[PDB]
Amino acid sequence: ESLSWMQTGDTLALSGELDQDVLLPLWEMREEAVKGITCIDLSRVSRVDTGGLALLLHLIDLAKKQGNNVTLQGVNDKVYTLAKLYNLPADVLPR
Amino acid sequence: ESLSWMQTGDTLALSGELDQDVLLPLWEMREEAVKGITCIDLSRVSRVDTGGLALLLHLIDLAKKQGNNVTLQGVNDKVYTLAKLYNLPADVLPR
Amino acid sequence: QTKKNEIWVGIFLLAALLAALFVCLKAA
Amino acid sequence: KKNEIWVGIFLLAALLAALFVCLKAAN
Amino acid sequence: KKNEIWVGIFLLAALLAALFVCLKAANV
Amino acid sequence: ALASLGHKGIKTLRTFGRAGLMLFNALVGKPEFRKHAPLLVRQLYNVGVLSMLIIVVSGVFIGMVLGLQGYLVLTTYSAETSLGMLVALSLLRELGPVVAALLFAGRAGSALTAEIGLMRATEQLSSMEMMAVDPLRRVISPRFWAGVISLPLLTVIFVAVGIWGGSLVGVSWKGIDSGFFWSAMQNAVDWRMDLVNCLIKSVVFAITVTWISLFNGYDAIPTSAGISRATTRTVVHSSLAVLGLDFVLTALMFG
Amino acid sequence: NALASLGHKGIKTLRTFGRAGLMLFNALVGKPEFRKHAPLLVRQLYNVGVLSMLIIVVSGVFIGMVLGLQGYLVLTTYSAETSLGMLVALSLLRELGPVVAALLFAGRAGSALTAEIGLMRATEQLSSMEMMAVDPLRRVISPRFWAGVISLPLLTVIFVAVGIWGGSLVGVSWKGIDSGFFWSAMQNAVDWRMDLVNCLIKSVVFAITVTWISLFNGYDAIPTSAGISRATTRTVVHSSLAVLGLDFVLTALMFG
Amino acid sequence: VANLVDMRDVSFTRGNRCIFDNISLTVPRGKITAIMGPSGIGKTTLLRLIGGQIAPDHGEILFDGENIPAMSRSRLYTVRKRMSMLFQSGALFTDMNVFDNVAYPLREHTQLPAPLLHSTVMMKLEAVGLRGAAKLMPSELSGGMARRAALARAIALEPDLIMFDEPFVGQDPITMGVLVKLISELNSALGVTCVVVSHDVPEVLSIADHAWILADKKIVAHGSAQALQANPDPRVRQFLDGIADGPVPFRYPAGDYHADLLP
Amino acid sequence: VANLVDMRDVSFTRGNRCIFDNISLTVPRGKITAIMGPSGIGKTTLLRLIGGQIAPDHGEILFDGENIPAMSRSRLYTVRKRMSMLFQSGALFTDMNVFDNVAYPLREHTQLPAPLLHSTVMMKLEAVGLRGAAKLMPSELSGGMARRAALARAIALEPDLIMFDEPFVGQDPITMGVLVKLISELNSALGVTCVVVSHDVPEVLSIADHAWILADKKIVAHGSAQALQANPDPRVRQFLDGIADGPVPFRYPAGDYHADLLP
């Protein structure tokens, strides 16, 4: 029941769960939280519901709008099956 | 397209078809047409619809109310299957 | 459930007649 | 139907009393 | 369709003509 | 503006045409009334008898309100003995027929539309057509004649009850002399022509109200939402038609 | 037979009154009552008020005309035809205005609300709203109730101010009364604050009663399509009876 | 003739929406003839066309060799004593009990004495199986008992074409079995010609002798039950097995995804 | 706990009619659980009991170990964010398009920024398959698309118990297949716990993991799909195959025959 991001250079890393209650603390300052990164870590994230996927897609889009092509890392396979349920193309959510 | 009954002693015999248009000429005088009979012939009857079965049941009942137990004769098997559709007991329509 | 309708329509017509008589007798 | 009939008779008596109270106005 | 429209025009014409002869019998 | 205004105009003309066609096809017939008595009696029960309590209870109250508002005006000119004339004329001329028509459109003018729309929803009209029974002659004309026969009677009841309510207020409560009230009322205004005019405008209101009701119930979209849009339309259009026809008939029959 | 039937009907009427009271009470107790409810109340003012405006305007015109005719014919026998404006204005501001506005509002908008809520209850929209923790009494009953209460007095004001103009059309323009006498006689002599305030008071009472009866009958109807059409008629009937009864009571209280 | 009803190039459109586009089907005499298809396609209008309640735009509807839309009104009302619809809502008259509903056609068209009429109505109510409910109002009936009473009414005048209108829609397997047994044994005993317009394939194809799968405003395939349970066509096979995705798009036409996802 | 919903000796009667008489069923967590039975038995009340909309007369309804009828109103409204019904009529709000209907629970309970909310609603509408109809009013929708949009709405707040209320009733096999695929893949991906109260046996038993056949006001049998397709009991077997005549009388209770035939 906590969300805390700590980018180590160009590798943003999220922590704790990720759902509708804690989306705001990261969405308020999404830009500086995504500036100059190429690897969005998710290994330290336990649960990702639909709102978490929406935030992840918006972060990936905001990073793609800065040139650096984004690569995800440590993504739980539950996120992958829950995203394939929504039929997300490989363009918006790079596997 | 005609109904004409001619009882030969105690054996009533019907003729022609038997349906809703020609039920009245026999129902008007059902009593004298059934008085003192024990065998209702039907071999000279081509088609018998539901109204014909109703008239036959009422005639058999009126004859049973005079003692003489009624026996049908020359009954077309189509009458029998169309009566078994309506699930008529052997009490009212003696086979 | 039909003699009910008959007697009620009769009562309604009788009430209409009594009303018409009341008016036409307080009319002249 | 006992309490129902009692309530009905009480309502009839109350309606009669209301008619009598309206009769306290005039006639 | 055409017959319905024609009956409608005729009925509206008859209604407005009745109302017109009425109002001409009303003002004067 | 003109893009949709002409479409609306032709749609309204087609609606009037459908209404006229329904009426003409439901009224022409010689064997109409006989063998239909068990239908017309039931319809007189549904339309008339069930719509009698509202008429009586509203006539009492309108008579009382007329009595109060006429006494408070006539007591200034020492003419409170003409309260009977005032109440009787205001009921026999405008209030009686118009209010009876409005309450009839409310209670029995919407019930007919709802009933016929529901009969069209469960496909009872099509099922009646499938067995060679013309519905316009079997289900429309009994209701039409029930309404036409039943409104001018509810109007007479409404009048003869409002007059009595005005008598309650004026004679009993306020204290006017009953002799002056009734005698003043009967000789001065209750001529045959006032009653005849009341009945004439009541019959016209009956015709228009029951026609609008039957048509809106017969032309409604069968869905359970199109029926409720037809009951409200029935009430609205019938109130508007009643008031307009009332103004016209007043301008005709009273100079 | 009478004792059992009368007792059962009395108990059923007591139960209906209790359920209506509970519905209104639970619908009219809340903190966010008017904030965050602006679009709801605006849409409900449109469905109840604006759509029920053409009938009110036209009926006002026609009743003003009928009053003008039937007042001219009465006053012309005493040469008091110049008091026709006073007569029309007072008859509208006292009885015809509020009562007829309430009757037409219960017919047009009092039945639409009942039908709409009954249909909302038939399609299980109210149960589907309760199932997502959104109190329907606070979401669909309160906006419609406040829309009706806010929208009937305005319709009554429009109805009056239009019937007065219709009476002027009949008396001044057609019958030929002096316009100056008409207006001046009417304005100076009788339209004081008390005549108006009473019109608004009885209009607000009629609003409360009509919209409450309509909402309750729409909220208590049997969900079937034959229970809705049976609740619309009950709405119209009960609303007309309540309007006329409360009108008699309010007249007896405020005038004599 | 062997084709009791014989449509030929009939096309019907309401508004601007082409409901039927040049369809033509033949109903053999004495055999059940299903007309299946997707729901919402308006396949119940196909019965109102045979009933003459609405007229088509082209084509002809030959009933026993007699073109129906060209007939007059009296001739139509005379022919309609041979047809009988069965609407899915029963279409029972709510102001009279089941007995009066069943007796309405007899009491209207035939001159039968009251005892004979009562006996006939009781016989038919027993044939369907609702004789015990001969005094219940239509409101007190269930959803399947209403259709059974309406079927008892439909066989009153001894017709020769009973056009069923989705009789199995929304009912447990018990009532479906009861209805399919009734339809089968009525087609067997009375020799009537049924036309079952439904979309409950596993139950409808249990009786039908020549089905007509109707999709895409026209007729896609037709044949016996076996000739349909083995027809290798994408649309027909999808409709028959209930395959979710196929020639009918499982996904509503949407278009792009990124613009809707990231506006 | 493994039983998400756990009824125990619950009995509910309206009027004087005993609807349920001492029934007790357990809904496992993460698995579909059908509740079948004859139509008109009122088996949809079994869902309103779990939803707390109506209170039973005896017994207890344990939701995740918490007795529901004993809870307060605020606690009930807090728990109801975990359940989600799906009424057979869709129950869509007719005064707003599909997008607003799906966004209503999100826009009501969660504080999501407008872009995130739009993205989430579009994702869910794509999951169901109605993303192309995100602008249509509920009246412009078909009969199955309405239920699909209502299902998209039911999964908005990420619940853990979706109580379906006869989703397959009266629909062609195409829409039945679409709905059963959606239900199966939602139970698979999201891990929600479905409770399908229906009476369309051949489609319901295709997904259900532990069915509960409910007849005669009580529970007659229960088990897996195989344990029901092989249970030798007259009532259960009649209901499963759709046998017309059996322990449920095909003929309405009538009595004598001669007195009705010859009065």
Numbering used by the authors:
A (entry chain K), B (entry chain L): 3 to 97
C (entry chain D): 2 to 29
D (entry chain C): 4 to 30
E (entry chain E): 4 to 31
F (entry chain H): 5 to 259
G (entry chain G): 4 to 259
H (entry chain J), I (entry chain I): 5 to 267
From the manuscript:
Mla trafficks phospholipids between the IM and OM and is important for maintaining the outer membrane barrier. The IM complex, MlaFEDB, consists of four different proteins: MlaD, a membrane anchored protein from the MCE (Mammalian Cell Entry) protein family, which forms a homohexameric ring in the periplasm; MlaE (also called YrbE), a predicted integral inner membrane ABC permease; MlaF, an ABC ATPase; and MlaB, a STAS (Sulfate Transporter and Anti-Sigma factor antagonist) domain protein with possible regulatory function. The MlaFEDB transporter is significantly larger and more complicated than most other structurally characterized ABC transporters, consisting of a total of 12 polypeptide chains from four different genes, with a stoichiometry of MlaF2E2D6B2.
In addition, we resolved both coils of the membrane scaffold protein (MSP) belt surrounding the nanodisc using the map filtered at 6 Å, thereby clearly defining the position of the transmembrane domain. While the vast majority of ABC transporter structures adopt an inward-open conformation in the absence of nucleotide, our structure of MlaE is in the outward-open state. Additional density was apparent in the outward-open pocket of MlaE, which is the right size and shape to accommodate two diacyl phospholipids. Thus, the asymmetry in MlaD appears to arise from its asymmetric interactions with lipid 1 at the interface of MlaE and MlaD.
